Amino acid sequence: QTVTEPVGSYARAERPQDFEGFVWRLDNDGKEALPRNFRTSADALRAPEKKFHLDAAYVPSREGMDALHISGSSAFTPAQLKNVAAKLREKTAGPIYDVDLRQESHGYLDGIPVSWYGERDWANLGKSQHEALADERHRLHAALHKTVYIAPLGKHKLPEGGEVRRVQKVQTEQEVAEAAGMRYFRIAATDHVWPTPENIDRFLAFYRTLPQDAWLHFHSEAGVGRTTAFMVMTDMLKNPSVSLKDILYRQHEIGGFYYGEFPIKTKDKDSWKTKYYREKIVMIEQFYRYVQENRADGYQTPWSVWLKSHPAKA
Amino acid sequence: TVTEPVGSYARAERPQDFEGFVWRLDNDGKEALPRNFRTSADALRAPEKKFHLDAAYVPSREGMDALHISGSSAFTPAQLKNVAAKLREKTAGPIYDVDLRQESHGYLDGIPVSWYGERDWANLGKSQHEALADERHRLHAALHKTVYIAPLGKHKLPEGGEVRRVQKVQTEQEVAEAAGMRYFRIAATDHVWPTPENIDRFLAFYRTLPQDAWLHFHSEAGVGRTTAFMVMTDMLKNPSVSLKDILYRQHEIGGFYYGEFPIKTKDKDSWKTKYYREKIVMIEQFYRYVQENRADGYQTPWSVWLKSHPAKA
Numbered sequence: 001q002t003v004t005e006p007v008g009s010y011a012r013a014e015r016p017q018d019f020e021g022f023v024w025r026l027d028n029d030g031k032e033a034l035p036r037n038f039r040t041s042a043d044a045l046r047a048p049e050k051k052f053h054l055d056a057a058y059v060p061s062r063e064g065m066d067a068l069h070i071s072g073s074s075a076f077t078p079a080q081l082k083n084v085a086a087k088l089r090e091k092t093a094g095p096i097y098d099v100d101l102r103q104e105s106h107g108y109l110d111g112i113p114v115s116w117y118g119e120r121d122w123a124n125l126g127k128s129q130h131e132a133l134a135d136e137r138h139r140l141h142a143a144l145h146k147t148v149y150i151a152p153l154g155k156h157k158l159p160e161g162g163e164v165r166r167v168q169k170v171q172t173e174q175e176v177a178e179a180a181g182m183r184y185f186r187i188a189a190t191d192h193v194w195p196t197p198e199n200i201d202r203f204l205a206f207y208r209t210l211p212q213d214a215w216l217h218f219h220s221e222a223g224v225g226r227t228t229a230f231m232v233m234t235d236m237l238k239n240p241s242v243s244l245k246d247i248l249y250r251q252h253e254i255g256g257f258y259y260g261e262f263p264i265k266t267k268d269k270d271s272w273k274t275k276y277y278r279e280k281i282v283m284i285e286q287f288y289r290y291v292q293e294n295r296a297d298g299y300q301t302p303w304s305v306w307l308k309s310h311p312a313k314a
Numbered sequence: 315t316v317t318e319p320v321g322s323y324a325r326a327e328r329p330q331d332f333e334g335f336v337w338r339l340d341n342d343g344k345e346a347l348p349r350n351f352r353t354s355a356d357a358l359r360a361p362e363k364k365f366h367l368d369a370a371y372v373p374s375r376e377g378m379d380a381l382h383i384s385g386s387s388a389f390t391p392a393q394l395k396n397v398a399a400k401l402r403e404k405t406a407g408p409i410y411d412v413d414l415r416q417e418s419h420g421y422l423d424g425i426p427v428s429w430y431g432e433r434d435w436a437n438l439g440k441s442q443h444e445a446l447a448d449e450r451h452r453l454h455a456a457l458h459k460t461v462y463i464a465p466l467g468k469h470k471l472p473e474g475g476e477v478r479r480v481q482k483v484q485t486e487q488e489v490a491e492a493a494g495m496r497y498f499r500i501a502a503t504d505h506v507w508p509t510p511e512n513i514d515r516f517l518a519f520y521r522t523l524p525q526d527a528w529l530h531f532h533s534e535a536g537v538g539r540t541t542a543f544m545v546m547t548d549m550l551k552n553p554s555v556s557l558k559d560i561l562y563r564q565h566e567i568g569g570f571y572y573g574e575f576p577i578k579t580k581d582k583d584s585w586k587t588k589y590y591r592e593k594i595v596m597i598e599q600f601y602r603y604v605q606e607n608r609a610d611g612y613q614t615p616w617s618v619w620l621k622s623h624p625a626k627a
């Protein structure tokens with residue numbers, strides 16, 4: 001009769017103590033002018049990726065895309081964010097937000113974007129946003145005037161090479177965003193899994209009070225899973241008359257992940273990802289249902305509450 | 315007036331520029347014994363070409379059978395048990411694990427690790443007391459915590475390795491005692507000539523040893539620091555042997571060659587050149603100390619004698 005973890009909360013069954021952070025991972029090498037996977041809702045649609053087995057002939061509706069005003073990308077250096085901000089300012093006169101979707105603790109050491117990485121990038125798994133940000137604040141401050149090892153991950157998601165330096169400057173992403181002329185909003189979402197009801201309730205309350213001309217620049221570490229999930233959510237919220245298929249196809253075709261059904265295939269070492277991919281597919285459909293069934297009364301019922309009374313099925 | 319005398323060049327380096335940043339894997343535990351394992355009873359081998367020595371020269375082995383010393387790289391607990399068993403076949407006296415490492419090190423879940431800073435100088439400038447306090451604190455702090463242990467690869471930076479939540483922490487003293495060996499620590503900085511403090515400590519220790527004591531010296535690789543102390547011991551115990559014979563024989567049983575040779579390093583290792591030169595001069599100065607002070611029973615320590623008889627570059 002009693003279910004321990006409902007669909008949409010599978011990650012709650014994992015043990016945080018088994019994925020604690022152990023290294024400052026390099027989030028971006030700063031070689032390119034812009035972060036990776038940079039895209040906006042004003043962009044032209046491209047051919048779908050073969051791995052998703054989609055209909056390349058299909059022409060998704062672009063209804064509402066010109067007025068959507070959102071973008072997404074991977075993590076960035078401060079110089080890259082300034083370049084992003086400049087580009088977005090050519091598209092709007094409203095406030096531009098850096099919507100940081102990363103639960104992992106991260107920041108900038110001597111201007112270098114880094115994150116405290118644990119296995120599966122789950123160093124803050126299970127923490128409330130309050131606890132995750134306290135960890136981040138503590139770790140960043142502790143790095144000042146201290147020697148740190150910053151490294152990119154290579155074979156088997158372990159450090160490979162990198163550099164050692166005695167830190168002279170520490171900055172939070174909020175500071176870097178403000179320096180780039182962007183407003184900042186943080187949603188502490190766990191890497192690789194469906195955002196939690198807490199994450200989404202927070203996002204919806206934030207969305208509700210945005211000025212009509214607000215531009216949302218979403219980002220995560222790679223600019224794929226989490227970034228696309230929130231871009232899809234925003235598209236659905238702002239353009240409720242658009243079909244689920246059109247939303248999923250167009251968010252994929254401008255450069256994001258495809259959040260519909262597809263032949264999931266993983267290497268043996270990544271088999272743990274499989275059920276999380278299936279969970280996101282089911283939850284994307286359930287969020288669409290939430291939008292359709294609650295927009296009429298102006299979303300009086302929060303997503304978390306509605307989901308508990310309308311649980312998703314595997 | 316000179317700021318730093320010969321033999322103390324490392325004192326000019328800045329400790330803050332070489333602080334520890336990773337738990338380095340000291341030995342992968344694949345072999346039964348530590349690397350560069352050798353004993354004074356071993357046969358002499360041909361010299362290594364890089365030292366440009368006379369391969370036809372046969373040094374005297376006078377005193378080697380009674381010297382009773384050995385050397386090696388760092389080891390896993392199992393490898394040390396293997397070493398202890400081997401050495402017990404050669405003596406009925408106490409067998410000492412003479413740990414020559416200044417860098418903080420120990421065992422996490424039985425894995426030999428050290429807190430590595432650039433040039434392995436994470437404890438540079440610390441007194442032995444401070445180095446050992448750092449070591450105790452860091453080891454204790456790892457218990458029940460997640461750590462990243464990695465071997466060094468390209469450019470002396472971590473490559474691969476493993477991540478684990480530590481369930482057991484031990485100091486090398488505990489591991490040595492569990493293997494049936496006595497333990498003595500000399501906190502010598504990697505890559506440079508041991509300090510007057512290091513050497514005064516070693517000589518006072520040497521003076522306390524019973525006739526049948528066996529000394530197993532080790533450092534990280536079992537090369538620079540290990541050979542320096544093996545050479546010192548050979549000179550102390552066999553003062554009638556020529557400097558050339560001591561240096562050749564300690565090299566030919568498997569150690570570094572501490573005499574003059576044409577030094578050539580990779581460009582990235584050019585900082586080592588003067589430290590190699592310094593060791594050559596200091597080895598000669600230590601030989602002089604032994605020859606001049608053995609007759610009266612070492613009434614005056616090395617540090618004092620060296621201050622009144624400074625070495626010259």
Ligand SMILES: O=P(O)(O)O[C@H]1[C@H](OP(=O)(O)O)[C@@H](OP(=O)(O)O)[C@H](OP(=O)(O)O)[C@@H](OP(=O)(O)O)[C@H]1OP(=O)(O)O
Nearest residue numbers: 120121191192193219220221222223224225226227228257
């Ligand atoms: O930067 P990468 O090494 O390329 O890793 C990314 C990144 O996550 P991590 O960097 O922390 O491993 C993606 O996610 P977001 O940070 O944008 O949320 C993730 O997206 P999903 O796991 O949710 O799909 C993606 O996975 P994908 O293979 O689908 O691109 C994954 O790539 P890899 O781990 O396979 O390199």
Ligand SMILES: O=P(O)(O)O[C@H]1[C@H](OP(=O)(O)O)[C@@H](OP(=O)(O)O)[C@H](OP(=O)(O)O)[C@@H](OP(=O)(O)O)[C@H]1OP(=O)(O)O
Nearest residue numbers: 387433434504505506532533534535536537538539540570
């Ligand atoms: O374990 P390794 O990677 O082989 O390094 C060793 C080790 O020092 P490190 O491990 O910290 O680099 C030697 O020293 P001891 O620990 O036994 O004192 C050192 O000896 P010296 O620097 O004093 O000479 C030797 O140098 P080498 O064998 O070239 O003489 C060096 O080897 P590499 O740095 O070349 O790998």
Ligand SMILES: [Cl-]
Nearest residue numbers: 613614615618
């Ligand atoms: Cl005196």
